[PDB]
């Protein structure tokens, strides 16, 4: 809870920056500043319109390679046991499987479209 103490002090610092932004300097005359600005002209609607995106495979690609990051990240505790053979073998097999999946979707233009 000492890092929670640090989080508490930074929360109090951030809220005092909010209050010193809002309440101290001057007045608050609204009613045209609140209008949505794009580049000089009043546009149609707003955001939250259906915004069809370019990449489809790339976010799922990130997700699955983050999952193999999750399986690979205990490498230092891999490196200290009496079974060196299975250690090095399954480590090489996991990275080689990662490279195999990458090589498949690299050769099958899974990244060469709307990137």
């Amino acid at each position: 809870m000492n890092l929670m103490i640090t989080l508490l002090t930074n929360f109090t610092l951030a809220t005092l920056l909010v209050t010193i932004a809002f309440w101290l300097p001057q007045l608050n005359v609204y009613s045209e500043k609140t209008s949505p600005y794009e580049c000089g002209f009043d546009p149609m609607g707003s955001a939250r319109l259906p915004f069809s995106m370019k990449f489809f495979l790339v976010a799922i690609t990130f997700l699955l390679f983050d999952l193999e990051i999750a399986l690979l990240l205990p490498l230092p505790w891999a490196s200290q046991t009496t079974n060196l053979n299975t250690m090095l073998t399954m480590a090489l097999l996991l990275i080689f499987l990662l490279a195999v999946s990458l090589a498949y979707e690299w050769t099958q233009k899974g990244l060469e479209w709307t990137e």
């Binding site: 809870m1 609607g45 939250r48 319109l49 259906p50 915004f51 069809s52 995106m53 489809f56 495979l57 976010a59 799922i60 690609t61 990130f62 997700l63 699955l64 983050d66 999952l67 193999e68 990051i69 999750a70 399986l71 990240l73 205990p74 505790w77 891999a78 200290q80 046991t81 009496t82 079974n83 299975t86 250690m87 399954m90 480590a91 097999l93 996991l94 499987l97 990662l98 195999v100 999946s101 498949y104 979707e105 099958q108 899974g110």
Partner: protein
């Protein structure tokens, strides 16, 4: 003063996670999910977990970033609703909150609650480790498995992930 701190962090987790699963707009749901994942990492960390909570914080949180990318890309309403906008959304959120406060009430002023099991009302410094002179640090050697003893398991897991990659590519390719 506090000694129920894991129960307290679990109450904050249940609040953020009921507001998560009450289904507002999914960006507000992801706000709830990042709050819930952060305090759940805090629960398992302050319980005695060394790294695995910060690990799942990282992994699960990058997954939520991908979920944000798709909920922005695909379909939103003309005006997205928040928790306190609708009849049904506000009703489910406040009644989940009421279930939370009601179980806090019927634990803190009572002995036990037996809805599905006899739940003992007192914080979990019991039962707990009586200071084992380990130095092997259980979670470190625990994830130092999957590699010494874990032969078949990483084989089928990585094979499932490779099949997952070719499956995603061929589902989008199936046009």
């Amino acid at each position: 003063m506090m000694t129920y701190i894991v129960f307290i962090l679990s109450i904050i987790f249940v609040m953020g996670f009921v507001g998560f699963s009450s289904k507002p707009s999914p960006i507000y749901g992801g706000l709830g999910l990042i709050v819930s994942g952060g305090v759940g990492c805090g629960i398992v960390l302050n319980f005695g977990g060394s790294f695995l909570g910060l690990m799942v914080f990282l992994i699960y949180l990058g997954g939520m970033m991908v979920v944000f990318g798709y909920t922005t890309a695909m379909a939103t309403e003309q005006y997205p609703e928040v928790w306190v906008s609708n009849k049904v959304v506000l009703g489910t959120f406040i009644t989940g909150l009421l279930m939370e406060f009601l179980m806090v009430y019927y634990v803190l002023k009572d002995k036990e609650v037996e809805i599905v099991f006899k739940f003992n009302g007192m914080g979990d410094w019991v039962i707990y480790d009586t200071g084992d002179s380990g130095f092997f640090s259980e979670e470190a050697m625990g994830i130092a498995a999957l590699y010494s003893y874990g032969t078949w398991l990483v084989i089928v897991t990585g094979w499932s992930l490779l099949i997952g990659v070719v499956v995603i590519m061929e589902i989008t390719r199936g046009n």
